[PDB]
Amino acid sequence: REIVSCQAGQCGNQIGSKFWEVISDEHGVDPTGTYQGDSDLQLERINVYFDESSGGRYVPRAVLMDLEPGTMDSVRAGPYGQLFRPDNFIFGQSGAGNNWAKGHYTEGAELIDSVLDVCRKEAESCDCLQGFQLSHSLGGGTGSGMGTLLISKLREEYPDRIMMTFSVIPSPRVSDTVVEPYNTTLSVHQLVENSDESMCIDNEALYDICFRTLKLTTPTFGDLNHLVAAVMSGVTCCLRFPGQLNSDLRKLAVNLVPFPRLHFFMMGFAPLTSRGSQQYRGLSVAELTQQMFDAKNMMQAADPRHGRYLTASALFRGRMSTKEVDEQMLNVQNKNSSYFIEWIPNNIKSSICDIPPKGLKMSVTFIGNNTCIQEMFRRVGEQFTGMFRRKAFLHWYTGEGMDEMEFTEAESNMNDLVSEYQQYQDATV
């Protein structure tokens, strides 16, 4: 059961960098590539994310993608950048320019063959691939278009594996790209079509978390991406360590995806404590559940009150017993039955893993297929219509090669997705 990861664009590249430093810390791997941990358990399943070399180094099974080698240079300049294999660095001459067309059809396509070659080499290097991870942004050019192209061409090469996407969705009030709706539509109608589970990050929910939950004065992208790294570590903690009730990535997929098109999830982490309030926390299973299901702790900008939980999953880590986790997961459903859809009982899967994060007595990662994803899809589609009616910024894509029919059918697919989220939210027994 091996995880091979790919990170595309700068967004995905720093997110994957932080994820790899987190995994190295968990398994006791120093930047030089050797093992200086403090227990044997860090060696039992170190092959999931690392491969031992003939130098003794534990090289990550990571493939980096960017039409801009600048982020490649930044990660190699980073503290843990020497961990990555040198030949896994795939890069080109000119950047995507935040253009899905350049990232997907002309610049990405010229390098997609090489990235497929290196990813396949990693695949046969792995003994049994449990699946692929992907980290990128839906608002970028080479993170979104090239990542979607990667996932599309790996659906037709490893369909039996589990390909996750921790895509970073954009936001109008967090607008830092004007073609975010175009790129987001073009990448969503590909992710809903080729990502078996595609769970999303909006930077504003992260800002809210670091504002009132963490209360960090000046949290840079480091502290910002640490949350995404933590949830990526949590979704595979049961894979990397023994557990009282363990699970794996495709366990999560099969227990969280009721219908093939409904696989866009939210994330959550717990515990998170503001700087100077640990003396007030209790750090128990009940507190973990409360911070799990708290609206503000969700790291995707959506309001679960306006939606309904199709299916939730709680990946607990630490020395805890199963009765309190089961009781809490039952009690939340019982007390919020208005927010759990009635035509499916006990929407919450619970998995228990031995190893808590280093320095944490107990923790939990939350995955939620709430129907409140429909508001973000509706917002992005509304912005897409707003620009498409005047066909603003469409000349870049049209001159780069794609036609208008692809855009129209992309929004048709995304509108069908949001319509069916609404249909199942309002469905009755």
Partner: peptide, 23 residues
Amino acid sequence: PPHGPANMMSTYMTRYDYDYNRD
């Protein structure tokens, strides 16, 4: 690789360590 005797003051002990890997 074998596990050592179950240590209760370590974040790296298993439930099966607490149960029967005492020795």
